[PDB]
Amino acid sequence: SFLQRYSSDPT
Amino acid sequence: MVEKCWKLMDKVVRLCQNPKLALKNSPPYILDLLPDTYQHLRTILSRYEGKMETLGENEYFRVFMENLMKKTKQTISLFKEGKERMYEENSQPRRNLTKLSLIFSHMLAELKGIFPSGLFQGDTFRITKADAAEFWRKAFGEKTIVPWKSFRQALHEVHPISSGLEAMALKSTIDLTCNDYISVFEFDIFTRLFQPWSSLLRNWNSLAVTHPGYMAFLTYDEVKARLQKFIHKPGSYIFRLSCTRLGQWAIGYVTADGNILQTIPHNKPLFQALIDGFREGFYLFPDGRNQNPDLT
C-alpha cells in the first residue's frame, strides 16, 4: 500500500 | 484487431498469475500494465465512436497496435520455450520477462502521452527541451513517429554519430518501445534524460556508453537486488531510467548505515548530481567498482 520507493536528494 | 490483442494480453496475464513467479507488486507490474493498457485502449475507442474511420488511418496508432501484438506474442512465446526456467530468479528467460514488463510500461506511457484523454494529440505534442523541439520540427514537422534510419540520418546531420556500433547503442537507448520507430515521445524522453541538446551525444556517451554505473532497462527491484552484494561497501551506486517518472533518472546507492536508497535528482543535471555525490561520499563506486569516472 505504502512501501519504500524514492527518497529525497542526499546531495 | 484490438479484440485479438486483448485475448493475447489476457493470456499473458493468466501466465503471469502463476504463484511460482512470486511476482512483486512493484512497477513495472505486468498484472497492472496490461489491464491499464486495455482500459486506455477502451478509452481511445470510446472517443472515436462513429469516426473509427479516422482512428484506423492513424499512423502512430497502427505502429502501436502492431508492436503491442508483437510484444504480447513474444511474451507468450517466451513462457512456452522457457517452461520451468521462468521461475528461476537470475535465469535469462526470467530476465527477458522483466525487460518485457519495462517495455510494456514504456508503451503505455507513450500511448498516454500521444493519446491523453484518449484523443490523438501526437501532432501537437509539446517537446520539453526548446532546442530539441526545434530539431524535431525542422526535420520532421508535426510527425508523430519516424523510422529509425530516418531518425538516425537526420540526427547525424546535427550531432555526428561516430560509428555503426555507437548508432546501435543509441538506438537501444532511445527506442523504449523496441519497435524500430522513434516517437516524438521517445524523442522527448531521450532529450530530457541527456540534455543539454548542444552536447547531446557527448552527454549520452559519458553517462551511458562509457559509464559503469548506468543500467539499461533495469527496474527498481533489480537495482535493489544488484546493490545487495555491495551492502558492506557504502558509496556503491548505479543509476537508470525511472520507469514511473519517464524522463527522469533514479540513482540507487548503499548508505553508511546499510540501507539501499533510490533517489531522483531534481534541480540539477545528472552530471552535477554525480559530481556532487562523489564529492560528498554518496556516489563513489559505480556498480561497486573502485574507480569512478571523471565527469569534470
Numbering used by the authors:
A (entry chain A): 1064 to 1074
B (entry chain B): 55 to 350
Question: What does the primary publication say about this deposited structure?
Answer:
The protein product of the Casitas B-lineage lymphoma (c-Cbl) gene is a multi-domain, multi-functional scaffolding protein with E3-ubiquitin ligase activity that is crucial for regulating cell signaling pathways. c-Cbl regulates cell proliferation, differentiation and morphology in response to growth factors, hormones and cytokines, binding to substrates via its tyrosine-kinase binding motif (TKB) in its N-terminus. Consistent with other studies, our previous study demonstrated that the pSpry2 and pEGFR peptides interact with c-Cbl TKB through (1) a positively-charged pocket into which the phosphorylated tyrosine inserts and establishes the majority of the hydrogen bonds, and (2) a hydrophobic cluster, which forms significant interactions with the conserved C-terminal proline residue of the bound peptide. We also determined the crystal structure of the doubly phosphorylated EGFR and Spry2 peptides complexed with c-Cbl TKB at 2.2 and 2.1 Å resolutions, respectively, and observed that the phosphate group of the Ser/Thr residue shifts away from the c-Cbl phosphotyrosine binding pocket with minor conformational changes of the peptides in the interacting region.
Recent work has revealed that both Ser1070 and Ser1071, immediately adjacent to the Tyr1069 are critical for EGFR desensitization, internalization and degradation. Similarly, the additional phosphorylation on EGFR significantly reduced the binding affinity of EGFR to Cbl when compared with the singly phosphorylated EGFR peptide, with 26- and 31-fold decreases for ppEGFR and tpEGFR, respectively. Notably, the difference between the double and triple phosphorylation for EGFR was not considerable, suggesting that phosphorylation at the pY+1 position is predominantly responsible for the decrease in binding affinity. Surprisingly, unlike the phosphate group of the tyrosine residue, which makes six hydrogen bonding contacts with c-Cbl, the phosphate groups of Thr56 and Ser1070 have no interaction with c-Cbl and are both shifted away from the surface. When we analyzed the electrostatic surface potential, the results showed that the region on c-Cbl contacting the pY+1 and pY+2 positions of the peptides is negatively charged, which could repel the high negative charge on the phosphorylated serine or threonine residues.
